[PDB]
Design a protein around this ligand. Structure first.
Ligand SMILES: CSC[C@H]1O[C@@H](n2cnc3c(N)ncnc32)[C@H](O)[C@@H]1O
Length: 263
């Protein structure tokens, strides 16, 4: 209930703080969808932003071993209340500072992520190579980026970052009313399933360069970033791509081949 969430906040003298991107899940049906997207719980679960503990409780009740990382210390009493009697390790810390590279191989991320950290956090977790599955809520626009196909407005660096590490699924869209307080945009449930690759800095130097200068062809964008123009011309030719092809027209394999051609 939006009422129960409002009432719970009121009882604990809390107000949702925009500095923490606080928008708390209201629907048991959405909670169920998140748990069902993440299961089976074959490794330890990390939840970033447990908030009032709604998803934390759902995860624990499904038998997950949970570490929940919450930056807002004001939420400690409600979390302790919600999670009374349940084995959750509550960590009061900025999740952007948590030692992610050390989590057990096979871990899971399951989280209603704060909008302002979702992209750098997911990027970092994917670079660790440690997760079996990452299941999380993001703004619909960010989900679209993470799941974009080439030659579309949402297609870009983030799409390619996700794709390099993982297959990506947008499973469900949630309206603003799924949260209290309601945010201004729709959200989406995303599932990422890592496929083995760790960071490839050479590849991402190329990908970042490709998309840096948006109004240029791929060739001129790379040339402006310091890639030898003649070599880019040849690599594109060898790929059977048009001289004026744009960055958003290349899929992950094409970028991998382009990188290989440049070197
Ligand atoms: C969508 S609700 C977001 C949840 O994440 C928490 N949160 C916001 N920023 C961070 C952060 N940097 N690390 C951990 N939790 C956070 C918020 O306080 C809230 O419970």
């Amino acid at each position: 209930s939006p009422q129960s969430v409002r009432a719970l906040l009121e009882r604990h003298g809390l107000f949702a703080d925009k500095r923490f991107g606080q928008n708390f899940l209201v629907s048991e049906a959405h909670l169920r969808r998140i748990v069902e997207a993440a299961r089976p719980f074959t490794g330890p679960v990390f939840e970033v932003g447990p908030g009032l503990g709604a998803l934390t409780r759902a995860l624990l009740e499904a038998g997950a071993e949970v570490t929940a990382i919450e930056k807002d210390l004001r939420l400690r009493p409600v979390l302790e209340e919600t999670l009374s009697g349940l084995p959750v390790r509550l960590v009061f810390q900025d999740a952007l500072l948590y030692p992610w590279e050390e989590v057990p191989q096979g871990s899971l991320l399951v989280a209603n992520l704060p909008y302002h950290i979702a992209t750098p956090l997911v990027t970092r977790l994917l670079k660790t190579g440690r997760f079996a599955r990452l299941v999380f809520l993001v703004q619909k626009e960010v989900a679209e980026r993470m799941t974009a196909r080439p030659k579309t407005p949402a297609y870009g660096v983030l799409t390619l970052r996700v794709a390099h590490h993982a297959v990506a699924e947008r499973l469900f869209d949630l309206p603003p009313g799924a949260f209290f307080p309601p945010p201004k945009v729709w959200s989406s449930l995303v599932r990422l399933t890592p496929t083995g690759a760790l960071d490839d800095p050479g590849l991402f130097r190329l990908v970042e360069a490709a998309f840096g200068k948006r109004r240029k062809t791929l060739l001129n964008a790379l040339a402006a970033a310091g890639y030898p123009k003649a070599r880019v011309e040849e690599a594109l030719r060898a790929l059977g791509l048009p001289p004026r092809v744009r960055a958003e027209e290349l899929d992950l394999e094409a970028f991998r081949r382009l990188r290989e051609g440049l070197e």
